[PDB]
Amino acid sequence: ADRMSKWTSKRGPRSFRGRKGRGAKGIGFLTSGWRFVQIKEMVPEFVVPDLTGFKLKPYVSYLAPESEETPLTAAQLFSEAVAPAIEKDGFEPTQEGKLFQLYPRNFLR
Amino acid sequence: GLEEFFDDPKNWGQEKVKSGAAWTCQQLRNKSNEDLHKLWYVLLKERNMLLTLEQEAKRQRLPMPSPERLDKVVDSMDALDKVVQEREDALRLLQTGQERARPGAWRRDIFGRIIWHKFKQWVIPWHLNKRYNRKRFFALPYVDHFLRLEREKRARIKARKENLERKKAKILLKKF
Amino acid sequence: IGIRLTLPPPKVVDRWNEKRAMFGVYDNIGILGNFEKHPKELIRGPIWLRGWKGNELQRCIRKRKMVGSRMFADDLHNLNKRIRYLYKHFNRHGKFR
Amino acid sequence: ARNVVYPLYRLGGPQLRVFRTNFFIQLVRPGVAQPEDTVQFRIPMEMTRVDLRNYLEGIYNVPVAAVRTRVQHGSNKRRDHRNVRIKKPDYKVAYVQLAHGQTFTFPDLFP
Amino acid sequence: LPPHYRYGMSPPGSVADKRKNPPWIRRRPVVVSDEDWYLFCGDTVEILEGKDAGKQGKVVQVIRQRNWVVVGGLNTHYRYIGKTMDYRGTMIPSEAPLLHRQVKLVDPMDRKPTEIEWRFTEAGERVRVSTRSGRIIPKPETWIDGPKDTSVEDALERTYVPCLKTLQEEVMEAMGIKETRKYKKVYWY
Amino acid sequence: KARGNEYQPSNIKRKNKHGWVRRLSTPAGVQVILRRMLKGRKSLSH
RNA sequence: GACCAAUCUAUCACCCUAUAGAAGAACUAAUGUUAGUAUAAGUAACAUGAAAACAUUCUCCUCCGCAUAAGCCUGCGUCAGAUCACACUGACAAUUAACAGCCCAAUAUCUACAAUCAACCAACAAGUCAUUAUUACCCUCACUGUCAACCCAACACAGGCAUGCUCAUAAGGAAAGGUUAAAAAAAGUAAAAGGAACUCGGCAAAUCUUACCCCGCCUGUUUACCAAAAACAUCACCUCUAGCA
RNA sequence: GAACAGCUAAGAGCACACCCGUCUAUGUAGCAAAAUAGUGGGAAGAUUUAUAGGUAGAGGCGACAAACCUACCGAGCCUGGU
RNA sequence: GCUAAACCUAGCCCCAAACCCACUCCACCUUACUACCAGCAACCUUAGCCAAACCAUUUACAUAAAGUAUAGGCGAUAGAAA
Ligand SMILES: [Mg+2]
Ligand SMILES: [Mg+2]
Ligand SMILES: [Mg+2]
Ligand SMILES: [Mg+2]
Ligand SMILES: [Mg+2]
Ligand SMILES: [Mg+2]
Ligand SMILES: [Mg+2]
Ligand SMILES: [Mg+2]
Ligand SMILES: [Mg+2]
Ligand SMILES: [Mg+2]
Ligand SMILES: [Mg+2]
Ligand SMILES: [Mg+2]
Ligand SMILES: [Mg+2]
Ligand SMILES: [Mg+2]
Ligand SMILES: [Mg+2]
Ligand SMILES: [Mg+2]
Ligand SMILES: [Mg+2]
Ligand SMILES: [Mg+2]
Ligand SMILES: [Mg+2]
Ligand SMILES: [Mg+2]
Ligand SMILES: [Mg+2]
Ligand SMILES: [Mg+2]
Ligand SMILES: [Mg+2]
Ligand SMILES: [Mg+2]
Ligand SMILES: [Mg+2]
Ligand SMILES: [Mg+2]
Ligand SMILES: [Mg+2]
Ligand SMILES: [Mg+2]
């Protein structure tokens, strides 16, 4: 009997305690006989490259110069990638069957 | 290895570190994608190390040598994330001209307030999903009274703030 | 104790203020301004009244029939309650009858 | 990552990738002296067991054998002058166990 | 922080400041305006009120939150710092703030208290200019690399190549990972 | 007998008798939640 | 009818006063409201078993204690300061699943002989547990609960709380702050002769008990919170209504 | 779904747990805005109870107590008319 | 002299004037802050207190005309336009 007490998994009964739970993000499902199925495709794979011979460092030196901030826009990217437009003197309009679709967020981060 | 969770043992017990200057936005924009990913990974490792050091210091009941480095690492991570988001937004605008990565649309719930409904992504269409069918979207007429009451409360708050600013300006003028 | 102790600061008062020095000016324009504007239009106040004394109940009915069309819900309800109470207290309660 | 919508894998979809991880992790000192080669970790909420396993195996390459996570509850018996409750931030805890009997010991600082 | 925060001499992040202004104070906020500030930290100023009404010094701190300016070696009040134990201890002359107007800026060679204007010059653009004459009053006022420091040229290589290739796809192509599977269409409601 | 003990706490019955679903099924609970939001309370319903 | 304490307004005042405009304009009381403080009052209520090297030992009680569904959320462990002395104030971290929860692809389709040691004996209240053929399916250990002296009664409340367990022991606790025992009351031990003769009543405590009248079939329920019945209900009888999904 | 020792031997009898409280005494700003012991009736059945859902006032329910419906029900409180 | 006594600035009411707000990141109608899979939903004469000493028909939601006509258990009252 508390309104300010935020409802969580440490309050309700066994049913709601095991149903809700913290941000678990369902990775698989159950198969009748309480036999969870770990879908290998849904398990994330941390793509970590090799940090061999890295030049930069997580900290910069104050001796470096200072430059103005200019948020990149679509016009600048178009002006940069302007090779075929000038050669006229390749584009992906429809990307429904593409690997990582742009408009519908299908790629993680 | 687990040794990466801590800095150079030679620096253990000094209350001073020589490292600062966070990665600005222009410096991150002037870099490739692989270099940006490597820098992000190194910054994440440094953040993990600094968080472990902070927890150890809190457990040992001692102050921090210099959280400025942690603040600068967090700022650099935020700047890298913002640059990546801006690049993705530019690519999306040049590919389809669609605003906001996550799709959505405006809708009217029961309260009537125009809320930006967020898509949950499903497998089956909407004309047969039992759960989504229950999530109706209409305010009905009787909620007009509550909407008018909320609008009147907002107008009262705005008028109160305006009179407050006017009285403050009058008092300031009286003082001089 | 109810009475305070230390006296107050010197309440400065500018008798020759911009409003005081011009208070009552440009009034009575009708008797000598070939009658062009009534003094009742000079006062700056409510819109439902601007040159009519009246009374409490009468002023309330005026504000209702002149501003009630754009008044808030709670304000309109309070005004109606006040009008009804004033009517019940005037046309029934009282003395000399 | 954390606080980000994931792509629902139907059936014949590609392998789920995770570029530029958001959530972080940090180890702490054993509370009641844990067994050998048993490292503790304070994991946020949006993180599972296999997630941490892959995270470690990909970043630090630590030969993680078994993991056993759990959620901890934050204190809440404290009020300010306003008589308002204060719930500390909750976090998940894990007990990673190295393989091959590497035998790891929690290092100490501030000599 | 809550509104009407009486900014004291101590910064808004010290133990003394927190002890002075606990989270249950409701004092009377002092009235202060004056957005075009000009008194910076380290400027030759001259006091014209109270003690040392003429002696020049140097500004140390400038708390613009309440229009306060601290000068070095002027308007100092003595204090028994700490004292740790129950005895004499040691006395130190602690400075005090001073509101603007009363404390004006000092000229280079003239060395007199005069008002400064914000004239838009051709140098781009607004700069201090005395009233008695020109005199552009200037503003007031080494790092060896470390183990985790980048450099001076690595951060200016400019390796970005604008190409519609996406970061995820580029990383996948660089790492050599292959995935012939296709992403079937999904619903969004 | 002791009449100072009538409360039998149970999250199930509590959420079933005063739940968002039950408060939005009928217009009664809708008006209740609207009035609560207009009043300015922190918690709208259990 | 004659004056007048306070305020704002327009008038020279300016160690506090005058002319006119206004009343939310003037308190010994309305078992009036808010804040502190007298009054019974330092009176009623109150705890902490003993020795001691504070290691440890001794005396007594126990229908209580163990784990769990319901319920709470860190609520007598450490670190420094606060004090019947402290569970009080700030940091420390716990509680890691194998126990329980989080659970079932479709189409036609069918389970007459209950359980009660179920075989003798059977009975009425007729009863809790099953699958057949085809299609497609082959990746497998993800998430939550795990503490305490604990829940609901405004209190640290002789009060209320289910399941499997020895119910007195391997669990669980201390009725006596220290002195004397004035008066009154209550819970217990015994009583020289009577055993109900004070009392409207055999109404507390002990025997353990014989024969009657009224009413109620007997069980069961009622006015939770003063009346628990000679009232309420029916196994038995009887009146009326209804020819149907 | 759960509970009902044992003893004598059937909506049988005594009696554990357990259900309610006919009576005394204490309490009456107390342990309690309804408590403490036995004498009390039942305790394989009109029996008690853990969980969930349904019956809401011109109403529901009611082995009629014109009783109960969140401490005060000859009809619980709130809102707006008041 | 213990306990006490005062500070006034944050903000409030009136109209005078415009017509207001509203998605960075995940989460929210199932048990709200829950990534995930086969089924009806809408439009309703408001009553009532009170006054006629009860009470049923009755009782209110710029200026002048005018509180006139008119309606009214023709009594308490209501009350327009050209
Ligand atoms: Mg009580
Ligand atoms: Mg008085
Ligand atoms: Mg009295
Ligand atoms: Mg009085
Ligand atoms: Mg007395
Ligand atoms: Mg004791
Ligand atoms: Mg436990
Ligand atoms: Mg004593
Ligand atoms: Mg004898
Ligand atoms: Mg005798
Ligand atoms: Mg006698
Ligand atoms: Mg006699
Ligand atoms: Mg007798
Ligand atoms: Mg007998
Ligand atoms: Mg009978
Ligand atoms: Mg009674
Ligand atoms: Mg009785
Ligand atoms: Mg009967
Ligand atoms: Mg019968
Ligand atoms: Mg009796
Ligand atoms: Mg009495
Ligand atoms: Mg009986
Ligand atoms: Mg019996
Ligand atoms: Mg028995
Ligand atoms: Mg009622
Ligand atoms: Mg009346
Ligand atoms: Mg009447
Ligand atoms: Mg007209």
PDB file of all heavy atoms in Angstrom, chain B residues 15-30:
ATOM      1  N   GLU B  15      47.415  10.929  -6.270  1.00  0.00           N
ATOM      2  CA  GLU B  15      46.498  12.061  -6.148  1.00  0.00           C
ATOM      3  C   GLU B  15      46.749  13.110  -7.227  1.00  0.00           C
ATOM      4  O   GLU B  15      46.470  14.295  -7.033  1.00  0.00           O
ATOM      5  CB  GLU B  15      46.590  12.698  -4.758  1.00  0.00           C
ATOM      6  CG  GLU B  15      46.346  11.728  -3.612  1.00  0.00           C
ATOM      7  CD  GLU B  15      44.928  11.191  -3.595  1.00  0.00           C
ATOM      8  OE1 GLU B  15      44.001  11.945  -3.955  1.00  0.00           O
ATOM      9  OE2 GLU B  15      44.743  10.014  -3.221  1.00  0.00           O
ATOM     10  N   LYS B  16      47.279  12.683  -8.373  1.00  0.00           N
ATOM     11  CA  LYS B  16      47.553  13.599  -9.474  1.00  0.00           C
ATOM     12  C   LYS B  16      47.836  12.826 -10.756  1.00  0.00           C
ATOM     13  O   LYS B  16      48.605  11.860 -10.750  1.00  0.00           O
ATOM     14  CB  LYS B  16      48.734  14.510  -9.134  1.00  0.00           C
ATOM     15  CG  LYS B  16      48.761  15.807  -9.928  1.00  0.00           C
ATOM     16  CD  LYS B  16      49.664  16.841  -9.273  1.00  0.00           C
ATOM     17  CE  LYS B  16      48.934  17.611  -8.184  1.00  0.00           C
ATOM     18  NZ  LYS B  16      47.925  18.554  -8.743  1.00  0.00           N
ATOM     19  N   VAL B  17      47.218  13.244 -11.858  1.00  0.00           N
ATOM     20  CA  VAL B  17      47.403  12.605 -13.155  1.00  0.00           C
ATOM     21  C   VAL B  17      47.522  13.691 -14.214  1.00  0.00           C
ATOM     22  O   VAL B  17      46.852  14.727 -14.134  1.00  0.00           O
ATOM     23  CB  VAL B  17      46.244  11.642 -13.488  1.00  0.00           C
ATOM     24  CG1 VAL B  17      46.529  10.890 -14.781  1.00  0.00           C
ATOM     25  CG2 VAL B  17      46.013  10.669 -12.340  1.00  0.00           C
ATOM     26  N   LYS B  18      48.375  13.453 -15.209  1.00  0.00           N
ATOM     27  CA  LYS B  18      48.616  14.407 -16.290  1.00  0.00           C
ATOM     28  C   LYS B  18      47.905  13.894 -17.538  1.00  0.00           C
ATOM     29  O   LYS B  18      48.471  13.148 -18.338  1.00  0.00           O
ATOM     30  CB  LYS B  18      50.110  14.593 -16.527  1.00  0.00           C
ATOM     31  CG  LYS B  18      50.848  15.225 -15.358  1.00  0.00           C
ATOM     32  CD  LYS B  18      50.521  16.704 -15.225  1.00  0.00           C
ATOM     33  CE  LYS B  18      51.363  17.366 -14.146  1.00  0.00           C
ATOM     34  NZ  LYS B  18      51.019  18.805 -13.972  1.00  0.00           N
ATOM     35  N   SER B  19      46.646  14.302 -17.700  1.00  0.00           N
ATOM     36  CA  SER B  19      45.851  13.900 -18.854  1.00  0.00           C
ATOM     37  C   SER B  19      44.546  14.684 -18.896  1.00  0.00           C
ATOM     38  O   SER B  19      43.800  14.711 -17.912  1.00  0.00           O
ATOM     39  CB  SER B  19      45.566  12.396 -18.813  1.00  0.00           C
ATOM     40  OG  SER B  19      44.873  12.042 -17.630  1.00  0.00           O
ATOM     41  N   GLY B  20      44.264  15.320 -20.017  1.00  0.00           N
ATOM     42  CA  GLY B  20      43.057  16.110 -20.162  1.00  0.00           C
ATOM     43  C   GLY B  20      42.743  16.387 -21.614  1.00  0.00           C
ATOM     44  O   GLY B  20      43.089  15.604 -22.502  1.00  0.00           O
ATOM     45  N   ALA B  21      42.078  17.518 -21.854  1.00  0.00           N
ATOM     46  CA  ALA B  21      41.682  17.917 -23.199  1.00  0.00           C
ATOM     47  C   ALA B  21      40.765  16.874 -23.824  1.00  0.00           C
ATOM     48  O   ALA B  21      41.233  15.852 -24.336  1.00  0.00           O
ATOM     49  CB  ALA B  21      42.913  18.139 -24.080  1.00  0.00           C
ATOM     50  N   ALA B  22      39.460  17.125 -23.791  1.00  0.00           N
ATOM     51  CA  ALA B  22      38.494  16.200 -24.361  1.00  0.00           C
ATOM     52  C   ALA B  22      38.430  16.356 -25.875  1.00  0.00           C
ATOM     53  O   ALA B  22      38.707  17.426 -26.426  1.00  0.00           O
ATOM     54  CB  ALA B  22      37.108  16.430 -23.756  1.00  0.00           C
ATOM     55  N   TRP B  23      38.059  15.270 -26.548  1.00  0.00           N
ATOM     56  CA  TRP B  23      37.942  15.282 -28.001  1.00  0.00           C
ATOM     57  C   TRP B  23      36.778  16.173 -28.419  1.00  0.00           C
ATOM     58  O   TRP B  23      35.620  15.880 -28.105  1.00  0.00           O
ATOM     59  CB  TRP B  23      37.746  13.863 -28.526  1.00  0.00           C
ATOM     60  CG  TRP B  23      39.025  13.104 -28.699  1.00  0.00           C
ATOM     61  CD1 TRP B  23      39.671  12.358 -27.756  1.00  0.00           C
ATOM     62  CD2 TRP B  23      39.816  13.015 -29.891  1.00  0.00           C
ATOM     63  NE1 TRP B  23      40.814  11.811 -28.286  1.00  0.00           N
ATOM     64  CE2 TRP B  23      40.925  12.198 -29.596  1.00  0.00           C
ATOM     65  CE3 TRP B  23      39.692  13.545 -31.178  1.00  0.00           C
ATOM     66  CZ2 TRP B  23      41.905  11.902 -30.540  1.00  0.00           C
ATOM     67  CZ3 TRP B  23      40.666  13.250 -32.115  1.00  0.00           C
ATOM     68  CH2 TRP B  23      41.759  12.435 -31.791  1.00  0.00           C
ATOM     69  N   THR B  24      37.085  17.258 -29.125  1.00  0.00           N
ATOM     70  CA  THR B  24      36.053  18.172 -29.586  1.00  0.00           C
ATOM     71  C   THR B  24      35.277  17.546 -30.743  1.00  0.00           C
ATOM     72  O   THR B  24      35.523  16.409 -31.157  1.00  0.00           O
ATOM     73  CB  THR B  24      36.673  19.507 -30.000  1.00  0.00           C
ATOM     74  OG1 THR B  24      35.644  20.494 -30.136  1.00  0.00           O
ATOM     75  CG2 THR B  24      37.418  19.367 -31.320  1.00  0.00           C
ATOM     76  N   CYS B  25      34.318  18.306 -31.275  1.00  0.00           N
ATOM     77  CA  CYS B  25      33.471  17.797 -32.348  1.00  0.00           C
ATOM     78  C   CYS B  25      34.186  17.829 -33.693  1.00  0.00           C
ATOM     79  O   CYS B  25      34.055  16.894 -34.491  1.00  0.00           O
ATOM     80  CB  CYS B  25      32.174  18.604 -32.417  1.00  0.00           C
ATOM     81  SG  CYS B  25      31.260  18.672 -30.860  1.00  0.00           S
ATOM     82  N   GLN B  26      34.945  18.894 -33.965  1.00  0.00           N
ATOM     83  CA  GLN B  26      35.632  19.005 -35.248  1.00  0.00           C
ATOM     84  C   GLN B  26      36.699  17.928 -35.399  1.00  0.00           C
ATOM     85  O   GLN B  26      36.850  17.341 -36.477  1.00  0.00           O
ATOM     86  CB  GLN B  26      36.250  20.395 -35.392  1.00  0.00           C
ATOM     87  CG  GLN B  26      36.523  20.809 -36.829  1.00  0.00           C
ATOM     88  CD  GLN B  26      35.251  21.045 -37.620  1.00  0.00           C
ATOM     89  OE1 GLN B  26      34.273  21.582 -37.101  1.00  0.00           O
ATOM     90  NE2 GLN B  26      35.260  20.644 -38.887  1.00  0.00           N
ATOM     91  N   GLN B  27      37.453  17.656 -34.331  1.00  0.00           N
ATOM     92  CA  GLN B  27      38.480  16.623 -34.395  1.00  0.00           C
ATOM     93  C   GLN B  27      37.869  15.261 -34.699  1.00  0.00           C
ATOM     94  O   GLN B  27      38.432  14.478 -35.473  1.00  0.00           O
ATOM     95  CB  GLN B  27      39.261  16.578 -33.082  1.00  0.00           C
ATOM     96  CG  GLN B  27      40.164  17.781 -32.858  1.00  0.00           C
ATOM     97  CD  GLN B  27      40.783  17.796 -31.475  1.00  0.00           C
ATOM     98  OE1 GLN B  27      40.412  17.005 -30.607  1.00  0.00           O
ATOM     99  NE2 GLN B  27      41.732  18.700 -31.262  1.00  0.00           N
ATOM    100  N   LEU B  28      36.715  14.961 -34.099  1.00  0.00           N
ATOM    101  CA  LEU B  28      36.049  13.692 -34.372  1.00  0.00           C
ATOM    102  C   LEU B  28      35.491  13.658 -35.790  1.00  0.00           C
ATOM    103  O   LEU B  28      35.540  12.619 -36.458  1.00  0.00           O
ATOM    104  CB  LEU B  28      34.936  13.456 -33.352  1.00  0.00           C
ATOM    105  CG  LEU B  28      35.403  13.222 -31.915  1.00  0.00           C
ATOM    106  CD1 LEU B  28      34.278  13.509 -30.933  1.00  0.00           C
ATOM    107  CD2 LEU B  28      35.920  11.802 -31.743  1.00  0.00           C
ATOM    108  N   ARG B  29      34.956  14.786 -36.265  1.00  0.00           N
ATOM    109  CA  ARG B  29      34.436  14.840 -37.627  1.00  0.00           C
ATOM    110  C   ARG B  29      35.542  14.664 -38.657  1.00  0.00           C
ATOM    111  O   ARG B  29      35.298  14.122 -39.741  1.00  0.00           O
ATOM    112  CB  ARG B  29      33.707  16.164 -37.857  1.00  0.00           C
ATOM    113  CG  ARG B  29      32.314  16.220 -37.252  1.00  0.00           C
ATOM    114  CD  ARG B  29      31.488  17.343 -37.859  1.00  0.00           C
ATOM    115  NE  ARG B  29      30.432  17.797 -36.958  1.00  0.00           N
ATOM    116  CZ  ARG B  29      30.629  18.582 -35.903  1.00  0.00           C
ATOM    117  NH1 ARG B  29      31.849  19.009 -35.603  1.00  0.00           N
ATOM    118  NH2 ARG B  29      29.603  18.941 -35.144  1.00  0.00           N
ATOM    119  N   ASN B  30      36.757  15.110 -38.343  1.00  0.00           N
ATOM    120  CA  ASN B  30      37.896  14.989 -39.253  1.00  0.00           C
ATOM    121  C   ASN B  30      38.613  13.655 -39.107  1.00  0.00           C
ATOM    122  O   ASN B  30      39.847  13.605 -39.103  1.00  0.00           O
ATOM    123  CB  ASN B  30      38.861  16.148 -39.020  1.00  0.00           C
ATOM    124  CG  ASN B  30      38.251  17.492 -39.364  1.00  0.00           C
ATOM    125  OD1 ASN B  30      37.424  17.598 -40.270  1.00  0.00           O
ATOM    126  ND2 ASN B  30      38.660  18.529 -38.642  1.00  0.00           N
TER     127      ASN B  30
END
